[PDB]
Design a protein around this motif. Structure first.
Motif, PDB file in Angstrom:
ATOM      1  N   UNK A   1       6.626  -1.064 -50.819  1.00 49.31           N
ATOM      2  CA  UNK A   1       6.034  -1.402 -52.110  1.00 49.31           C
ATOM      3  C   UNK A   1       6.824  -0.692 -53.203  1.00 49.31           C
ATOM      4  N   UNK A   2       6.479  -1.002 -54.437  1.00 44.02           N
ATOM      5  CA  UNK A   2       7.078  -0.363 -55.596  1.00 44.02           C
ATOM      6  C   UNK A   2       6.380   0.953 -55.867  1.00 44.02           C
ATOM      7  N   UNK A   3       7.170   2.013 -56.017  1.00 44.23           N
ATOM      8  CA  UNK A   3       6.656   3.360 -56.237  1.00 44.23           C
ATOM      9  C   UNK A   3       7.340   3.938 -57.461  1.00 44.23           C
ATOM     10  N   UNK A   4       6.549   4.447 -58.401  1.00 46.79           N
ATOM     11  CA  UNK A   4       7.088   5.064 -59.610  1.00 46.79           C
ATOM     12  C   UNK A   4       6.557   6.477 -59.776  1.00 46.79           C
ATOM     13  N   UNK A   5       7.452   7.371 -60.178  1.00 45.02           N
ATOM     14  CA  UNK A   5       7.124   8.768 -60.450  1.00 45.02           C
ATOM     15  C   UNK A   5       7.637   9.074 -61.850  1.00 45.02           C
ATOM     16  N   UNK A   6       6.736   9.356 -62.782  1.00 41.09           N
ATOM     17  CA  UNK A   6       7.155   9.822 -64.084  1.00 41.09           C
ATOM     18  C   UNK A   6       8.122   8.883 -64.771  1.00 41.09           C
ATOM     19  N   UNK A   7       7.943   7.575 -64.592  1.00 38.15           N
ATOM     20  CA  UNK A   7       8.811   6.594 -65.225  1.00 38.15           C
ATOM     21  C   UNK A   7      10.013   6.130 -64.416  1.00 38.15           C
ATOM     22  N   UNK A   8      10.252   6.761 -63.269  1.00 38.94           N
ATOM     23  CA  UNK A   8      11.346   6.383 -62.370  1.00 38.94           C
ATOM     24  C   UNK A   8      10.797   5.491 -61.265  1.00 38.94           C
ATOM     25  N   UNK A   9      11.370   4.298 -61.113  1.00 41.52           N
ATOM     26  CA  UNK A   9      10.842   3.292 -60.200  1.00 41.52           C
ATOM     27  C   UNK A   9      11.787   3.005 -59.046  1.00 41.52           C
ATOM     28  N   UNK A  10      11.233   3.002 -57.831  1.00 36.94           N
ATOM     29  CA  UNK A  10      11.938   2.555 -56.636  1.00 36.94           C
ATOM     30  C   UNK A  10      11.228   1.330 -56.098  1.00 36.94           C
ATOM     31  N   UNK A  11      11.965   0.248 -55.896  1.00 37.98           N
ATOM     32  CA  UNK A  11      11.405  -0.904 -55.201  1.00 37.98           C
ATOM     33  C   UNK A  11      11.707  -0.799 -53.701  1.00 37.98           C
ATOM     34  N   UNK A  12      10.838  -1.354 -52.872  1.00 38.15           N
ATOM     35  CA  UNK A  12      11.048  -1.332 -51.436  1.00 38.15           C
ATOM     36  C   UNK A  12      10.882   0.026 -50.778  1.00 38.15           C
ATOM     37  N   UNK A  13      10.154   0.932 -51.413  1.00 38.37           N
ATOM     38  CA  UNK A  13       9.875   2.240 -50.827  1.00 38.37           C
ATOM     39  C   UNK A  13       8.918   2.106 -49.649  1.00 38.37           C
ATOM     40  N   UNK A  14       9.223   2.796 -48.553  1.00 37.81           N
ATOM     41  CA  UNK A  14       8.288   2.877 -47.431  1.00 37.81           C
ATOM     42  C   UNK A  14       7.100   3.736 -47.824  1.00 37.81           C
ATOM     43  N   UNK A  15       5.926   3.114 -47.813  1.00 34.74           N
ATOM     44  CA  UNK A  15       4.653   3.748 -48.097  1.00 34.74           C
ATOM     45  C   UNK A  15       3.892   3.739 -46.785  1.00 34.74           C
ATOM     46  N   UNK A  16       3.700   4.924 -46.221  1.00 37.19           N
ATOM     47  CA  UNK A  16       3.118   5.065 -44.900  1.00 37.19           C
ATOM     48  C   UNK A  16       1.608   5.179 -45.048  1.00 37.19           C
ATOM     49  N   UNK A  17       0.895   4.191 -44.519  1.00 37.83           N
ATOM     50  CA  UNK A  17      -0.540   4.072 -44.701  1.00 37.83           C
ATOM     51  C   UNK A  17      -1.235   4.775 -43.552  1.00 37.83           C
ATOM     52  N   UNK A  18      -2.084   5.750 -43.864  1.00 34.80           N
ATOM     53  CA  UNK A  18      -2.758   6.512 -42.822  1.00 34.80           C
ATOM     54  C   UNK A  18      -3.896   5.712 -42.197  1.00 34.80           C
ATOM     55  N   UNK A  19      -3.870   5.621 -40.874  1.00 38.16           N
ATOM     56  CA  UNK A  19      -5.028   5.174 -40.108  1.00 38.16           C
ATOM     57  C   UNK A  19      -5.876   6.374 -39.682  1.00 38.16           C
ATOM     58  N   UNK A  20      -5.225   7.511 -39.448  1.00 42.43           N
ATOM     59  CA  UNK A  20      -5.902   8.730 -39.027  1.00 42.43           C
ATOM     60  C   UNK A  20      -5.315   9.908 -39.781  1.00 42.43           C
ATOM     61  N   UNK A  21      -6.181  10.849 -40.152  1.00 42.73           N
ATOM     62  CA  UNK A  21      -5.752  12.115 -40.734  1.00 42.73           C
ATOM     63  C   UNK A  21      -6.554  13.238 -40.085  1.00 42.73           C
ATOM     64  N   UNK A  22      -5.974  14.435 -39.997  1.00 35.60           N
ATOM     65  CA  UNK A  22      -6.695  15.562 -39.415  1.00 35.60           C
ATOM     66  C   UNK A  22      -7.673  16.147 -40.426  1.00 35.60           C
ATOM     67  N   UNK A  23      -8.556  17.000 -39.929  1.00 37.74           N
ATOM     68  CA  UNK A  23      -9.680  17.489 -40.714  1.00 37.74           C
ATOM     69  C   UNK A  23      -9.267  18.177 -42.014  1.00 37.74           C
ATOM     70  N   UNK A  24      -8.156  18.905 -42.001  1.00 37.85           N
ATOM     71  CA  UNK A  24      -7.775  19.648 -43.201  1.00 37.85           C
ATOM     72  C   UNK A  24      -7.438  18.697 -44.338  1.00 37.85           C
ATOM     73  N   UNK A  25      -6.916  17.516 -44.019  1.00 40.36           N
ATOM     74  CA  UNK A  25      -6.659  16.519 -45.055  1.00 40.36           C
ATOM     75  C   UNK A  25      -7.970  15.930 -45.574  1.00 40.36           C
ATOM     76  N   UNK A  26      -8.860  15.550 -44.665  1.00 43.93           N
ATOM     77  CA  UNK A  26     -10.155  15.013 -45.059  1.00 43.93           C
ATOM     78  C   UNK A  26     -10.884  15.960 -46.005  1.00 43.93           C
ATOM     79  N   UNK A  27     -10.829  17.246 -45.675  1.00 46.51           N
ATOM     80  CA  UNK A  27     -11.590  18.276 -46.372  1.00 46.51           C
ATOM     81  C   UNK A  27     -11.012  18.627 -47.742  1.00 46.51           C
ATOM     82  N   UNK A  28      -9.795  18.185 -48.010  1.00 39.80           N
ATOM     83  CA  UNK A  28      -9.194  18.410 -49.315  1.00 39.80           C
ATOM     84  C   UNK A  28      -9.239  17.140 -50.158  1.00 39.80           C
TER      85      UNK A  28
END
Length: 330
Positions: free
Chosen positions: A92-119
């Motif tokens: 997908x297209x990903x932009x940071x602070x006005x800088x755009x990359x097309x075709x960036x790999x965006x890794x979609x989480x199916x599972x996350x460990x507890x420390x991620x959930x808790x934050x």
């Protein structure tokens, strides 16, 4: 091109920093932890196991007209702190602070460990180490920086982390107003996929500088400064009542103490970490035992110049053909 985004501590201790990132079309803004010690851009998403989502903003690829499933691709990562996540992959297209990359790999989480959930404040990670560490299989993917690099005015990004305050990540330029004096550059080894370099030594407080080579990584995704046991012992020996506690998991000190500074060498230059940067507060609410921000790397297997160290400097991650790291006082 260039980009510039503000990065903000997640809490009063500067446990981590979040930076807003635009993903997809129309934009979905997620607050990501920019991590120079890993190389996956992964997000909480509409695919994340529901019980493992608790307040995070999610990426929904079905609502992005530019999202495309990267067919057959999966990812799975385990971090040095024992946390982990895994899932599948979109581009997908990903932009940071006005800088755009097309075709960036965006890794979609199916599972996350507890420390991620808790934050609840961290919606995912944006890796900025070398793409050789990226975990996507069977086709390894490039980091946001690697994808942006050729388009940038200069093949660099900079980290300017604040102490108890916002800071800045810049891509493609060096802001000469953001630091004092000169930037000292030092060699990098990419052999382990990290921004790995060798400090020239250290001092504790107003003490004499000890010249000694300390190999370690510049890692914005690690909170603390992890150094050899000898160095860490020399530091905490200057704090009355400080001790290593196996039950707590590191050095603790009386909250009534005034902490000395810690200096590290970058070539012939010196970066001074003020004592207050080394205070991580009570071990538990109401305790008078405080957790130290300098800890032993023994049993990590690598020394880590994490946020405690990096936030004392303006840091240049130079991604030229031969990468280097630059440090300036600020």
């Amino acid at each position: 091109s260039t980009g510039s985004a503000t990065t903000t501590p997640i809490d009063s201790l500067d446990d981590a920093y979040i930076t807003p990132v635009q993903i997809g079309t129309p934009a979905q803004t997620l607050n990501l932890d920019f991590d120079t010690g890993s190389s996956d851009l992964w997000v909480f998403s509409s695919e994340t196991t529901a019980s493992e989502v608790d307040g995070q903003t999610i990426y929904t690829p079905s609502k992005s007209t530019t999202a495309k499933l990267l067919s057959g691709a999966t990812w799975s990562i385990s971090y040095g702190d024992g946390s982990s996540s895994s899932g599948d992959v979109y581009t997908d297209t990903v932009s940071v602070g006005g800088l755009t990359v097309t075709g960036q790999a965006v890794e979609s989480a199916k599972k996350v460990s507890s420390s991620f959930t808790e934050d609840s404040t961290i919606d995912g990670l944006l890796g900025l180490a070398f793409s050789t560490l990226n975990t996507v299989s069977p086709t390894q993917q490039k980091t946001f920086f690697d994808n942006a690099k050729a388009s940038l005015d200069s093949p660099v990004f900079t980290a300017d982390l604040g102490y108890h305050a916002p800071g800045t990540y810049n891509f493609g330029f060096i802001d000469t107003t953001a630091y004092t004096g000169s930037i000292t550059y030092t060699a990098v080894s990419t052999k382990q996929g990290f921004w790995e370099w060798t400090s020239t030594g250290y001092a504790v407080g107003s003490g004499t500088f000890k010249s000694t080579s300390i190999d370690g990584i510049a890692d914005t995704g690690t909170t603390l400064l992890y150094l050899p046991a000898t160095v860490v012992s020399a530091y905490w020996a200057q704090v009355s009542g400080a001790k290593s506690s196996s039950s707590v998991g590191g050095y603790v000190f009386p909250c009534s103490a005034t902490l000395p500074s810690f200096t590290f060498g970058v070539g012939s230059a010196r970066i001074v970490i003020p004592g207050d940067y080394i205070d991580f507060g009570p071990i538990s609410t109401g305790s008078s035992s405080c957790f130290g921000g300098i800890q032993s790397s023994a049993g990590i297997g690598i020394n880590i110049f994490g946020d405690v160290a990096l936030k004392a400097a303006f840091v240049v991650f130079n991604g030229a053909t031969t990468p280097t790291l630059g440090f300036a006082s600020k």
